[PDB]
């Protein structure tokens with residue numbers, strides 16, 4: 224590892240990671256507090 | 261026939277002339293640019309309208325311009 | 341100096357003309373080939389087949405009734421080139437002649453002659469041939485290739501402005517003119 | 530007058546891709562026969578994919 | 592309070608019909624399994640959640656239609672006067688806060704990298720420290736918005752905006 228973090232900084236990796244976290248957060252909220260209308 | 265016109269923004273790079281597949285354009289001498297040549301279109305009865313010249317031109321809004329017009333058997337690219 | 345060349349001087353070489361007619365003929369109808377094979381024994385079958393030398397990409401009836409095109413050049417060696425009408429042919433050492441049905445096919449072969457051979461061939465001449473027998477020389481029209489500037493050439497269809505300085509169509513209505521052809525220097529037909 | 534080599538100009542030629550945009554001057558030609566003497570370079574390429582163009586003095590704001 | 596011809600879900604018979612219809616389906620599925628088995632437990636969890644959900648909708652002042660399904664009120668005046676602001680009006684404010692935040696973070700990062708040597712390299716390779724800093728400093732985004740607006744630093748002037756031949 225000397226340029227591996229720069230690879231992780233590229234747009235599709237950062238996108239996959241960000242969506243995964245944002246999705247995970249919404250899933251976990253919809254586990255704890257379901258059926259908000 | 262199509263009509264090919266050259267405007268005074270030409271810089272005489274010869275790229276349009278090189279691009280043309282039916283020998284319509286040539287370079288003639290001129291004093292309006294550093295290269296001392298402008299493009300010209302003597303043989304527009306042989307122009308097929310491909311617009312390859314306009315793709316080659318590097319000036320901002322092209323100095324060569326092809327206005328499509330009436331069709332002939334030459335302009336329609338027919339081998340029959 | 342440079343003078344306008346003649347196709348007649350090129351067409352004197354009867355072998356090169358024979359070859360040109362051979363290659364610019366259409367492939368035969370199945371009926372005709374059947375008859376040709378019918379008149380020979382079996383050993384001579386490839387010779388019959390070897391007698392055809394054309395393709396389906398060659399001249400049709402328009403060439404006879406409207407105009408055909410001829411390209412001539414001289415090669416330093418016998419080499420295989422690619423026809424613009426599909427397939428391959430052999431240029432001979434010495435004079436080559438080839439008939440085509442469009443000017444774009446001629447110049448396509450010309451473009452191949454000037455790029456795809458190690459001694460580059462620069463000496464091709466293209467002519468237009470009418471049915472009556474008039475031959476008009478086309479290219480290179482003044483001896484110099486058109487990408488090179490040559491004295492004696494004049495400006496054709498030059499507009500002495502930029503393209504943004506053209507008029508509006510609504511300003512030349514019912515007058516018989518367009519904005520693009522106003523004040524054009526060297527306006528050809 | 531001409532702009533200085535290295536100065537910044539604003540294009541005022543309406544048919545240009547870089548109208549109302551700023552470019553760097555690279556070269557000025559001094560002959561009077563030349564119709565578009567100033568060479569300008571821009572950061573944003575146009576649709577053709579080029580980044581440079583010749584201009585006249587009456588098409589620049591410097 | 593019944594408005595617009597709607598009944599409250601808490602005192603609607605069609606609401607109960609719907610709950611019955613869902614619970615009955617789950618019972619039918621349970622008939623196939625054995626009362627201790629793990630599929631059975633799954634179907635019980637499903638049924639529990641279902642009854643809980645209907646109970647929640649009942650004590651929320653939701654308003655049912657003739658279909659027996661809850662209906663939302665979107666005029667803010669009607670919503671606030673009859674206690675339905677949680678259906679659309681609060682979510683509005685909630686969406687507009689988060690959308691303003693995302694915009695502000697994005698605009699900020701773009702204005703920051705635009706002063707770099709090759710600004711386009713910082714668009715395909717994200718400057719992750721810079722991006723995290725911007726993401727967390729942008730929680731008070733109306734500060735920046737109202738400042739930019741009132742000062743005049745929000746809009747580019749028309750003379751600097753590329754435009755066509757008009």
Ligand code: CLA
Nearest residue numbers: 230233234235236238239240242243244246247714715716
């Ligand atoms: C090997 C597989 C692979 C795949 C599938 C992709 C796919 C993509 N790359 Mg590429 N890329 C790759 C290899 C790959 N790349 C490599 C080896 C390099 C050299 C490092 C690049 C360099 C590169 C650059 C520089 C860029 C891309 C971009 C892109 C995106 C194109 C625009 C787009 O679709 O954005 C729309 C975005 C999406 C559709 C988001 C998808 C993200 C994940 C997959 C979804 C996860 C969300 C959730 C958990 C599940 C889905 C549910 C949801 C849809 C509701 C696309 C994600 C461009 C981009 O803009 O990406 C942001 C971009 O700038 N890539």
Ligand code: CLA
Nearest residue numbers: 365366367368369370371372373374375392394395396397
């Ligand atoms: C409407 C149908 C039709 C038309 C308009 C043409 C027209 C043409 N054919 Mg084609 N041809 C056809 C059907 C047709 N053909 C069929 C069905 C076959 C058999 C597959 C052929 C085999 C064929 C050959 C080998 C050649 C041509 C050639 C030509 C061209 C010159 C004239 C000729 O020599 O005919 C030639 C011969 C025929 C038309 C055969 C007639 C078929 C008879 C009536 C039997 C059909 C039924 C039979 C059970 C099928 C046997 C299949 C078996 C061989 C596997 C001309 C463009 C020539 C060409 O391409 O010049 C470059 C050429 O060399 N044709």
Ligand code: CLA
Nearest residue numbers: 693694695696697698699700701717718721722723725726
């Ligand atoms: C900084 C990011 C940003 C900001 C502040 C804006 C702001 C705006 N957009 Mg634009 N847009 C953006 C990115 C952005 N956009 C991107 C990435 C795309 C390509 C998909 C577009 C495509 C687009 C279109 C086609 C249109 C707009 C329009 C608009 C205007 C009205 C609101 C809207 O339509 O939202 C809609 C926004 C989208 C459809 C794109 C989603 C933007 C994402 C969710 C946020 C930015 C993502 C970015 C990667 C964040 C990285 C930040 C991080 C590194 C710190 C508003 C000025 C409209 C307009 O012109 O109004 C007059 C319009 O038609 N936008």
Ligand SMILES: CC1=C(C#C/C(C)=C/C=C/C(C)=C/C=C/C=C(C)/C=C/C=C(C)/C=C/[C@@]23O[C@]2(C)C[C@@H](O)CC3(C)C)C(C)(C)C[C@H](O)C1
Nearest residue numbers: 240241242243244245246247248249251689693723726727
């Ligand atoms: C998402 C997001 C944001 C964020 C965020 C952040 C930082 C959130 C943090 C997330 C975090 C911190 C995620 C938790 C991990 C825990 C897991 C997965 C479970 C543990 C794993 C399990 C199940 C362990 C179980 C066991 O030990 C048991 C019981 C017995 C052992 O014999 C065996 C094992 C080991 C199996 C912003 C910044 C707020 C806004 C942005 O817009 C979007």
Ligand SMILES: CC1=C(/C=C/C(C)=C/C=C/C(C)=C/C=C/C=C(C)/C=C/C=C(C)/C=C/C2=C(C)CCCC2(C)C)C(C)(C)CCC1
Nearest residue numbers: 235236237238239240242243244245246247248250251254
């Ligand atoms: C190769 C590559 C790539 C690719 C990628 C991809 C394609 C991906 C995908 C991805 C994906 C596809 C993702 C996914 C996600 C998911 C998620 C996000 C999930 C979550 C979940 C959860 C959170 C859950 C939980 C739960 C529940 C709910 C219940 C119970 C159990 C549990 C707890 C588990 C990229 C582009 C980077 C580029 C470079 C290379």
Ligand SMILES: CC1=C(/C=C/C(C)=C/C=C/C(C)=C/C=C/C=C(C)/C=C/C=C(C)/C=C/C2=C(C)CCCC2(C)C)C(C)(C)CCC1
Nearest residue numbers: 249259260681682683684685686687688689690691693694
């Ligand atoms: C959950 C929830 C919430 C929240 C939410 C949010 C906050 C969201 C966000 C979201 C987001 C943030 C999203 C985004 C998205 C985006 C997209 C999806 C986009 C797309 C785009 C497109 C598609 C485009 C296209 C185009 C172009 C680019 C150009 C040309 C034209 C066109 C148009 C084609 C609330 C609070 C309300 C409440 C509760 C529930």
Ligand SMILES: CC1=C(/C=C/C(C)=C/C=C/C(C)=C\C=C\C=C(C)\C=C\C=C(C)\C=C\C2=C(C)CCCC2(C)C)C(C)(C)CCC1
Nearest residue numbers: 665666667679680683690691692693694695696698736745
């Ligand atoms: C409230 C409400 C309502 C209504 C409303 C209305 C009626 C309104 C209107 C309105 C109008 C009639 C208008 C408006 C206008 C607007 C504008 C004009 C805007 C602007 C914006 C901007 C400018 C921007 C922004 C931004 C961005 C993009 C980025 C980030 C930052 C900022 C924020 C700056 C309803 C019922 C629906 C629902 C409930 C709520």
Ligand code: SF4
Nearest residue numbers: 280307308310311313
């Ligand atoms: S349109 Fe094609 S044939 Fe006509 S001048 Fe341009 S390049 Fe030559």
Ligand code: SF4
Nearest residue numbers: 270271273274276317
């Ligand atoms: S018209 Fe364009 S391509 Fe042709 S010589 Fe002039 S500048 Fe070069």
